[PDB]
Amino acid sequence: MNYTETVAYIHSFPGDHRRILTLLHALGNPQQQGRYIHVTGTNGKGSAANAIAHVLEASGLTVGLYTSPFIMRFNERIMIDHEPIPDAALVNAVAFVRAALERLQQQQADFNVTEFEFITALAYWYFRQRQVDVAVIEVGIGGDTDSTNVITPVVSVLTEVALDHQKLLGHTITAIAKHKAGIIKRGIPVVTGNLVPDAAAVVAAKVATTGSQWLRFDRDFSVPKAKLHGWGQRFTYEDQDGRISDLEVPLVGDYQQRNMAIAIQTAKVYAKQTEWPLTPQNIRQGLAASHWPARLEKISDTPLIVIDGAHNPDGINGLITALKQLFSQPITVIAGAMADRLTAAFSTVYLVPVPGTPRALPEARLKDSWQEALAASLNDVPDQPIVITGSLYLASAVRQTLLG
Numbered sequence: 001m002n003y004t005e006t007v008a009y010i011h012s013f014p015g016d017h018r019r020i021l022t023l024l025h026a027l028g029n030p031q032q033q034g035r036y037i038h039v040t041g042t043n044g045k046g047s048a049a050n051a052i053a054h055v056l057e058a059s060g061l062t063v064g065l066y067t068s069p070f071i072m073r074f075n076e077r078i079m080i081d082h083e084p085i086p087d088a089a090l091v092n093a094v095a096f097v098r099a100a101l102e103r104l105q106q107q108q109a110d111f112n113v114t115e116f117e118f119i120t121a122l123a124y125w126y127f128r129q130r131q132v133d134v135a136v137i138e139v140g141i142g143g144d145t146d147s148t149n150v151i152t153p154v155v156s157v158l159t160e161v162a163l164d165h166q167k168l169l170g171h172t173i174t175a176i177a178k179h180k181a182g183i184i185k186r187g188i189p190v191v192t193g194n195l196v197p198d199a200a201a202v203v204a205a206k207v208a209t210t211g212s213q214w215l216r217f218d219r220d221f222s223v224p225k226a227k228l229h230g231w232g233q234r235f236t237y238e239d240q241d242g243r244i245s246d247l248e249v250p251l252v253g254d255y256q257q258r259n260m261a262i263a264i265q266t267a268k269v270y271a272k273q274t275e276w277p278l279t280p281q282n283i284r285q286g287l288a289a290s291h292w293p294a295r296l297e298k299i300s301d302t303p304l305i306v307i308d309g310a311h312n313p314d315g316i317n318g319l320i321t322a323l324k325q326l327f328s329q330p331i332t333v334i335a336g337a338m339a340d341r342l343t344a345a346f347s348t349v350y351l352v353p354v355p356g357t358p359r360a361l362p363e364a365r366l367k368d369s370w371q372e373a374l375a376a377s378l379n380d381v382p383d384q385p386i387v388i389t390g391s392l393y394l395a396s397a398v399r400q401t402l403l404g
């Protein structure tokens, strides 16, 4: 197949890990080789994972990064030193995994794997083929039964536990926490955010049984100082070894302080566990040189356009709150019911549908598309800033169009 057929192939796919393990076994069990950092959490995993990678890359390691979802194009989900797998490399890898799959389907007639299982198996194989020093692995959903959970990492990360995936993980924080805690492994250290009580209890009980060292935000490490500074933040990190002062990261949003602190502590743990050098300078450089697409990103200066994947209140309110701090003057917001918090916060607020979703009737200011809303604002008030937010899918659609 060619590249386009290959991607189509991947997306044509339909409780334990037997299916993926069978595929991995046919691929030579690449998941058993090399090193990994396993990251989960209801919110913040992509952010923490991305930062951990930048930091370790700056220290001189070749780093695999597996994240979801993609923003510009599929290839972004499998990176090595932040370079997406090349189109031709994807074709070859898909061909290789497909051949193993088909061979397997000869032995066991109705053998199949899910889409995430196929991609995950391919990513593990690819990371090993390229012999990366370490692969930073973002859990798809939950932890314990997530398709990525067939590895023993050097360190595990649990950013936070919230109700976002109730329909699959459970009805209570405790239930969801048990899923996330499933990536904590025997003797392997775990770095977490300052988890709410119910989640913290689940983790405390888990590390008691695994004997894992548990480093927790606001207990073992923290961010004593932090302020907005340009389209980013200047902050101080502190842990058992002291402070790394005035670090800078091109990321706005209060919650990103916790995610960056988690990233820093995790990189330090990884480096210590592997007897690898990691300096405050490596950390500073990784954080500075890092970048975050579609998450409160100012994709343009004149006109001033910002795209955001703010999905939940924490993000949108962190947005509204950041917007307020970032902008003291009138702006336009194109959002595709955190809506009420926007219309009361900003002058011009347009509501549009999310590009790849069914338009639904309003339950007892509205435009038919982001392009129409963008065009209108630019025509009416060319110099008024425009912030696009609401969904990652909309953000991604806009970025693809405007930065393509």
Ligand SMILES: Nc1ncnc2c1ncn2[C@@H]1O[C@H](COP(=O)(O)OP(=O)(O)CP(=O)(O)O)[C@@H](O)[C@H]1O
Pocket: 041, 042, 043, 044, 045, 046, 047, 048, 068, 069, 140, 293, 294, 295, 296, 308, 309, 310, 311, 312, 314, 315, 316, 392, 395
């Ligand atoms: N492009 C984007 N993608 C995801 N979350 C984004 C975002 N832009 C802003 N955010 C906000 O940042 C936080 C999520 O960041 P991150 O991408 O690191 O999370 P995550 O990867 O754990 C979620 P998922 O399970 O959907 O992949 C949330 O508060 C979310 O609303």
Ligand SMILES: [Mg+2]
Pocket: 042, 140, 141, 164, 165
């Ligand atoms: Mg999720």
Ligand SMILES: [Mg+2]
Pocket: 045, 046, 067, 068, 069, 138
């Ligand atoms: Mg993610």
